[model samples]
Every structure is written in C-alpha cells, then in structure tokens.
Target: ETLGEKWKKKLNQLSRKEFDLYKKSGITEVDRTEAKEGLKRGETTHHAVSRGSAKLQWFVERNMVIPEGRVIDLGCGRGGWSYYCAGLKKVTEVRGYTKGGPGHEEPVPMSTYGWNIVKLMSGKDVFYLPPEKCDTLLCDIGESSPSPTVEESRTIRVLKMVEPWLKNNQFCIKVLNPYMPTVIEHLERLQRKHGGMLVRNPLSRNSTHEMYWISNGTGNIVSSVNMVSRLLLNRFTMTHRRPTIEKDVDLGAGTR
Candidate 1:
C-alpha cells in the first residue's frame, strides 16, 4: 500500500471522526501519527514546525524581500512546503504543477492543505496574483524507482519556466537528498544555460524533506545562529553613544 493508504488505515484503526478532523486540518496520516506520538511523549513538533516556518520568514524579513514576482511548483504533490512559504508567508505570487486537480480526491485534499494554510494566516492574499505572473516555483515531484533521467528533466523544465522571473532576484528550491548527486550534475549543466546558485540543506531529523537555498547572490549562501561567536562577543561596546530622540532634545538635556 501507498504511504497515504497506510496512514489512512492507521487512522481508521484509531477512529474515523478523529482521523477526519486532522485530515481536514491539513494534517496527513503521516503527520497525524508523527504529531500524536510527539504529543503523547511531551515532545516538541509545535515548536519545531513553528521554528522552521519562522526561520524562513526571518530570511525574507532580513533580506527585505517581497514575495516572488511569481511563484511556481512543478510536481507539487499536495503543495505542503509551497503553501508554508507562499501561502503562510504571503508571498506575492505562487503556482504549482500537480498531476491532478479537484477531481483527484486524495491529492485534491492536498491542495486544500495549501489553501487552508493561506486562509489561517492573517494578511495573506493567495488568490491575488494572476496566473501568468506566478513565479515562485516549488517541485516535490516523486517518481517511481530507477528513473533519475525523468527527475532531472522535471527539474530543468521547472528551472526554465521560472528563469525569466529570477533575472536579478534571489529564490530557493527543494530537492531530494539521495538524488543530490544527479540533481547537482544536472543543475551544473543548466547553469550554463541560465545562471543561479544551488545551495543544499539536507533534511534534518525534524524535517519531512530536503531543500536547496538557491539565490543569485554570491555572499552567505546559508545561515545559522553562531552560538559560540555570540558567546564571545561583548554585550556592550564603548564607542557607541546612546541614541537620542526629540523628547530628549526638547528637554535640553537630562530630563530623567
């Protein structure tokens, strides 16, 4: 049975309504088990998920970035990651390439996950962008075993479609860890045709998938909190003067 089917079976064994509620909440059967186990153990999936999303948000904020002028996702099955970044992040535009639309109930529900993520987040406008302008591309295309060529073609196609929008802006992509060897080789060849950096961050124990932090810039391809550096730094420096405001100036000196 498929992963989704396995999850469905497990959920059925638990309770139908309970399973349905979580399913409706955008929590897949895999997520349900993962979440429930974590919850029962007094673990931290909430913090982990929140932090992962926040880290992405921090990158955008630090960069003073707007959502992609357009967004796109090739082989965006269920659109989970895309939704987190585009929908919850309120990216300017987003798009995805899926195998089926509303008719495919199982995968159709996945699209709803994206929509639900968008709806729950405040100040987001998922439907605001027009079709042609959607440029932030995401691809989570899973293929049958022993078909690396098919996967490479899919990546190249996705890169080509989004190349026009990425001209002078930074963007990111996600890919499978095991396929990195072939994926990188294919990407290197494509760099000759269209330029971009492909920085890989393998999936962590807490993550569902691996990701690439692609961009147009040369400096700082990745980021992490340098706790050691932070510990060594002084909390205050002597050279800096205290900041002042109009109130301080108006009082003509030490008002306090």
Candidate 2:
C-alpha cells in the first residue's frame, strides 16, 4: 500500500505488517506508530511533525552528504530524521542523543538500545563524543517555548563539547528564524570565537523557521530532500509568556 494509505490506516495503532514495513523503511517504529497515534488520539501537545519536517528539509539543503563518516543526531526525538539518515541513507554511523532528567519528559520514540543514554535534558550536562569521530552533527533541538537565550545557551554548550568531533566536519543546526535574533547573534559569536564559518539559509518560503550551517573551512556541500510542509497549531501552557534575556546582549534588528 501507499505511504499515505499506510499512515491513514495505521493511525494510532500499527498492525504487525505495518510495523514490519515501518522498520524495513528505516523509520523509527515507535515514532511512526506513536506519533501517528498521538496525532489521532490528540495526545501530542507540541507539533513535532511540522518542526521535524522543516528541520529535515533544511538539513538536506545544506547537503548532509558526508560520503563516509559518523553522523550524530542531537535531541533525536522519536529518531525521526536520525533513523532515516542512519538506516536508510546509509551513513557510516548515526548516533542519537537525548537528555532525560527531572523537569523533563521522558524522551519518547527511541529504541531501548545503543550507547550511554544518559544526559541532563535541560542542557546542564555536556555531550561527549570521540574526537574527530562524526563528520556531521545534526542539531534538531526544539524548545517547548520561545526563549532565544535558553535556546542559544543550550546550542553553544553543545558546540563546545561537540567541537572536537566536528573540528574538520560540518554541522547543521535548527533555530527559530523569524523570532530568534539572539540565535543569529549567538552564531556570529560562535563563528568568531571558534574561527569557523556560519551560513544561514531558508528551507523554503513556507517554512516556519530557518537553518544554520557551520563549517571550519570553505567550499562545503550537503544534500537535502524535498517534502511538503505540514503544520499543527494549538495552545500550549507557558512557563513564561515573555522572552527573557539572561544577560545584557544585543539580539539585532529582527528580534524586536
């Protein structure tokens, strides 16, 4: 059966056959089934699907093609894009990471396997990887709300720890574009501080946000795939309704 039909039929509940097909197709079986179910049962408060889709598209545009090297997926919820890059795209190695602890919901959609599944989800802990191991690291960190300071802080923290693995490699990171000037400023600081180059690009006109690609050297390329942009709008409880700046910093023109 077609993918649409499969999604429609298997919504919220996966048949054994559908489950097998999901695995065969390199999709995270749990995410495919559960996200479908969550959407159907109205369980997901956040629009992970639309966010993930935009991220995947943006990554592809920056050319995620690494020829042969390990690719790490940061904040790999449900292994959506991670599973595809590793299982289907045939990357040499694809490692997934998620932070789990108090004040954080148990990261859903990962198989109960692989390396150390331990990290403070709140970005307090550093991510450690072997030096120069991964050729590319995809940062798909999405905040539950809009906090540029919190977002940029977590992003820079990741960069510091992951820098060794990505010294000569490339990184594709997602950030809230229209409302995230601090993120742009953060990238500027990161590039100057680390002596790397940052390239920001729009995934598409219809996309919700933009992506930032970083490289230590010039003339880098990656591949991307095209997909329809989907959206789910809802009201979510807020920790704070206002954007809070941790320290005094200029966020640039678009932020205000």
Query: Best candidate per TM-score, number?
Result: 2
How far is 15's C-alpha from truth in model 1 (Å)? 34
The residue ranges of model 1 lying beyond 4 angstroms of the native Cα positions read: 1-70, 86-90, 101-131, 142-144, 147-170, 175-186, 189-195, 204-213, 216-256
TM-score of 2: 0.45
Lowest summed lDDT across 10 adjacent residues in model 2 is found at 226-235
CA lDDT of every candidate = 0.36, 0.40
Against the hidden true structure, what lDDT does model 1 obtain? 0.36
* 98-170 per-residue lDDT for model 1 (tens digits): 4544532112222222343221222222233233444454434333222334545554554444455444444
What lDDT score goes with residue 165 in model 2? 55
Where does candidate 1 have its weakest 10-residue lDDT segment? 246-255
Candidate 2: misplaced stretches above 4 Å? 1-54, 61-67, 88-90, 101-132, 142-147, 176-186, 189-210, 214-256
